Design a protein around this nucleic acid. Structure first.
Lengths: 146, 171, 257
RNA sequence: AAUAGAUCCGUAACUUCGGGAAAAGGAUUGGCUCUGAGGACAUUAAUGUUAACUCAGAACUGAAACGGACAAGGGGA
RNA sequence: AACCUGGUUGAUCUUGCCAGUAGUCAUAUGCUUGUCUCAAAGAUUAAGCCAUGCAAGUGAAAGUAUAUAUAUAUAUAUGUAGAAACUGCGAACGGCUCAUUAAAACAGUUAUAGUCUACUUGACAUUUAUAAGGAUAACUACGGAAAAGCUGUAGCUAAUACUUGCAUUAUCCUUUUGGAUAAGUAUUUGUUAGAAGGAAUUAUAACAAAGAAGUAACACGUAAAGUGUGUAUCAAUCGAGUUUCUGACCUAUCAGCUUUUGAUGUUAGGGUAUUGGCCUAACAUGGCUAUGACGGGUAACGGGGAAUUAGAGUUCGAUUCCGGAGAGGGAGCCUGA
RNA sequence: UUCAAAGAAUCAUUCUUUUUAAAAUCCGAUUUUGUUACUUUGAGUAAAUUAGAGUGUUCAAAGCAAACAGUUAAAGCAUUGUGUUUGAAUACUAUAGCAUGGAAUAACAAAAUUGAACAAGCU
RNA sequence: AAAAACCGUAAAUCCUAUCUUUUAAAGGAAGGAGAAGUCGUAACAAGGUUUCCGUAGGUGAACCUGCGGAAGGAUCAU
């Protein structure tokens, strides 16, 4: 009931029967959620569970699509100063980041994201926090200074 | 051979420049099968010798519950989480399932504790029945194409049940 | 091919090396050694343009083949050998000792040192590595892996090094009274006693350090060198004493004579 | 004489926008071991009686060749 | 130096452009040229073709030395040298050109806790010995063609080329001191514990299995014990590959593009020095887009930089240096870090 | 959506300093109290080139040197002689990134189809 | 060691489909310029029929006509 693929998930680096599910606090002034603490999910690429080490750049972003499995699209809106006109300009681009199953995400919420090693060819970012923000209309159009 | 002449994430084409360098390399794959213990050696960049296993018969296999490991021999390969012709052609990979011997582990059991460190662990009745049959399954964990040896671990418990139910509501 | 480059253009040489424009086009690229190419200088220009002892690369090579040059009481024949940040160089028959320190201008300069002081050298450890057997080694800026340091020694603490016996003598911490000196900052050449450390979450640790003339200036933790405690500088500082006299009043001092 | 059935793909000029069109042009179908999937009948989310021909990929195979006979457009400017 | 003048009219004031003006390290060219300093120079087009000659070799204490020559007391011991050749390193540096190149290269800023790293430096290692075995050049002797920076057999020798192989240490008990216990480095697999960093499945320690490559069968001679060469490992060195975040010219008479031919992602596995659809199998239908995707063009290598500037800005940047590319066009490969 | 008041110094002004609700912290008093843009300072800010320092290549384009007494010696210093002083700095190296002071101006959330804080008791 | 088969990288050539750049091209229809040429009066005055727009038709040409508009009109006005 915890695995459903044509393989098995082992949660490497957790230990099974000696002792005295594995978790890691990944530092950066962050505490793992109780969801990841007491959950049943297994993922080899979760920052709190898998082999990925968080290092590099930390961003804040705007989730775009959730119906994609285990991954989400993060928009980052900003103003591009134009030297010629001394005026800003609305530009953006969306980065895909791996979302752990230990989080609940909805279209319209801010997510804090951290860099990891290349996870896919264009996915090398991981979620750490879900800030509830509930939105109206299409999530593409709203502009946030973050 | 690595990391170019693919499509951009937006779907557009990235037309090629930077004709292929050597550090990407991408050597052809090696298919290890059942046979005599013969291997080859490949020279990777920086003078690193890689132990290419083209045909393997035996290796180290570890009992995780007892925390031990002994040398024994694989006789057959039954399943891998990858495609099916890979196991049908008797190939070994780092998560494949093979059939491991029972007698050397039984002798270890007899010498260490007997009966037919951290001992007295109650083992498992299904594993004991498999040992009585003398044909116990295991999962290979080493990378034969890289390390050149077939180091496996004895499959047990819930994972054993999962790997068994998918094999035999079943054919 | 595109292998390791083995040429240095004269205009591409580091600024403190100070190679002219019309005196050729290639600079002497320091051979692989204990220190960086950019922050360390080779024997060639050390003995040609700094000491002004020779006049031509052939004559510079004519000198070192005779074992009349010694660094850390060790003979080195490698012509393009990076001296390091501070060391103990020695030429035998003239009975003189040069140590390499910084300038207020922010340069490399030979500094006169007596025999007893030249017997005293310092090393700033970069990291501690513990190997098999639960033994500890520290790697210094000198490109030296000194094993079995004192347990109290930390990653930022520095260690007195006795060059002849190759052993540590006394540790120096990083306290508020830990007199330090800037190595690779834009404030290179300023000697200071540190005022406070401003730890930042997972980025380069910028620390404020206090000058003798009551000037506070900040620099990363990576380019600091503890060269003594609040008592005194363990190393004889150059004529400028490591005190950055301001550029405005430099001119009146030069005008008066 | 040349294919010509069927399935899948692809289909230009021109046009009265309906067509052109089976345009043109490709691939498969052979042989077998296979496998899997898509209705009516009953019990307090589940397990029993009973009636399709449509797809799919791995094999190997057989004299690198197959709508095997019959039957069945030559296209284009 | 934040500048204007002539030209529409019979005459006037405007808009408006043309012409005038000066700069160009921006090129060509006409005329002329007494000096000196200083010095651009086949980029523009043909990254078209090349006759010819050169442009990468190397031995000063230290690999091999009966080709040979010479000097010390007497066939004697040393030498000083040394053609050729074996061996080692380099030749992957440098120099040139800018075809290609439009989120590519580059630049600034990150990580590599996802990797490799020659020479050098510092530390340091594990499972016949008064010194072991072959394999061969140059060379002698016969030639071939017109020839290659061409070559066959017969015979020989070496070396730091190739190949085998000569202890010992740590820990526990009386407690300086006697016994006993044990012996694998990286690397890989399974089970536990676990000074720092920001987060380790870290360093490391223990158990059970494998486990290469070594720890000198080598050469020179400085204190009134030394060095070169070579070897397992760790760190820096000289770097390199991947890599985050931001930045680009014109074009909509390019609006929807990618996806069976990987497109977006998961799992599993191969492959790489390492992560990764880099590749393969199964699975899911995703991904980018008027904030301009996908296309097209550039007489586009990019950057700091150049001209011009009161400030704005405009144009250029093949070309001293940095990064990328290529060696008539693709593609493949050994060697070697 | 937090106003304002009081005190030292140049010329008649200007300039500086101190506090004035509420929540945790120190036994009458010791002290932090949204995010971002923006804005202030810094650290990494290759060299060449740019402006610029100092320096009389005959001046200059230059370049990064040179100067000082010395018909031949004086001092400085070393317990006989040993030259000395020096210079090659500075700003810039985006607009993106790191840290950082920040009252204003801007946006974002929290704000009653009910949401709180405190106190007592229960698990 | 020659040699063969297999996946794999893949030069080079050919089929179809598409994109990009010149031109041969018989010929056609234009435009612009030069030029005392021919015919007509179209506009400029109420240009002798006020001028102009859109649309439609006719005409050798400028032009003519109808429909509905405008004054940039020749009327700011019982």
């Amino acid at each position: 009931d915890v695995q459903h693929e044509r393989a098995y998930q082992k949660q490497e680096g957790a230990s099974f029967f000696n002792s005295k599910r594995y978790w890691k606090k990944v530092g950066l002034g962050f505490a793992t959620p109780k969801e990841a603490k007491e959950g049943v999910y297994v993922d080899k690429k979760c920052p709190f569970t898998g082999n990925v080490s968080i290092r590099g750049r930390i961003l804040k972003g705007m989730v775009i699509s959730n119906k994609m499995k285990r991954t989400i699209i993060i928009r980052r809106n900003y103003l591009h100063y134009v030297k010629k006109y001394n005026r800003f300009e609305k530009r953006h681009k969306n980065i895909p980041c791996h979302c752990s199953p230990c989080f609940d995400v909805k279209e319209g919420d801010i997510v804090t994201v951290g860099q990891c090693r290349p996870l896919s060819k264009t996915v090398r970012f991981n979620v750490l926090h879900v800030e509830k923000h509930q939105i109206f209309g299409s999530a593409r159009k709203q502009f946030v200074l973050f | 051979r690595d990391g170019r002449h693919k499509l951009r994430l937006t779907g557009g084409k990235k037309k090629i420049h930077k004709k292929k360098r050597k550090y990407e390399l991408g050597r052809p794959p090696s298919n290890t099968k059942l046979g005599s213990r013969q291997v080859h050696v490949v020279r990777g960049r920086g003078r690193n010798y890689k132990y290419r296993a083209i045909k393997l018969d035996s290796g180290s296999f570890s009992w995780p519950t007892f925390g031990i490991s002994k040398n024994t021999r694989i006789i057959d390969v039954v399943y891998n989480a990858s495609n099916n012709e890979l196991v049908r052609t008797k190939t070994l990979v780092k998560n494949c399932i093979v059939v491991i011997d029972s007698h050397p582990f039984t002798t270890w059991y007899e010498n260490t504790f007997g009966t037919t460190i951290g001992k007295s662990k109650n083992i498992d009745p299904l594993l004991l029945e498999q040992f009585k049959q003398g044909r116990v399954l295991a999962c290979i964990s080493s990378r034969p194409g890289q390390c050149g040896k077939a180091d496996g671990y004895i499959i047990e418990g819930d994972e054993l049940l999962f790997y068994k139910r998918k094999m035999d509501k079943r054919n | 091919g595109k292998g390791i480059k083995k040429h240095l253009k004269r205009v591409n040489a580091p600024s403190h090396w100070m190679l002219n424009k019309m005196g050729g086009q290639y600079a002497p690229k320091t051979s692989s050694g204990p220190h960086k190419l950019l922050e360390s200088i080779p024997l060639v220009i050390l003995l040609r343009n700094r000491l002004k002892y020779a006049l031509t690369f052939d004559e510079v090579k004519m000198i070192l083949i005779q074992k009349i040059v010694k660094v850390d009481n060790k003979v080195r024949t490698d012509c393009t050998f990076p001296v390091g940040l501070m060391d103990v160089i020695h030429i035998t028959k003239s009975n003189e000792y040069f140590r390499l320190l910084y300038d207020i201008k922010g340069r490399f300069v030979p500094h006169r040192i007596t025999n007893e002081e030249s017997k005293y050298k310092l090393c700033k450890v970069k990291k501690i590595l513990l190997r098999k057997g639960r033994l500890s080694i520290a790697v210094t800026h000198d490109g030296r892996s000194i094993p079995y340091i004192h347990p109290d020694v930390k990653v930022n603490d520095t260690v007195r090094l006795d060059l002849e016996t190759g052993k540590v003598l006394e540790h120096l911490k990083f306290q508020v009274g830990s007199l330090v000196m800037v190595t690779a900052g834009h404030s290179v050449g300023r000697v200071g006693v540190i005022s406070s450390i401003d730890k930042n979450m997972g980025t380069y640790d910028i620390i404020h350090v206090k000058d003798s003339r009551n000037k506070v200036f900040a620099t990363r933790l990576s380019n600091v060198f503890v060269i003594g405690d609040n008592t005194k500088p363990y190393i004889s500082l150059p004529r400028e004493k490591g005190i950055k006299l301001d550029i405005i009043e430099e001119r009146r001092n030069r005008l008066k004579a």
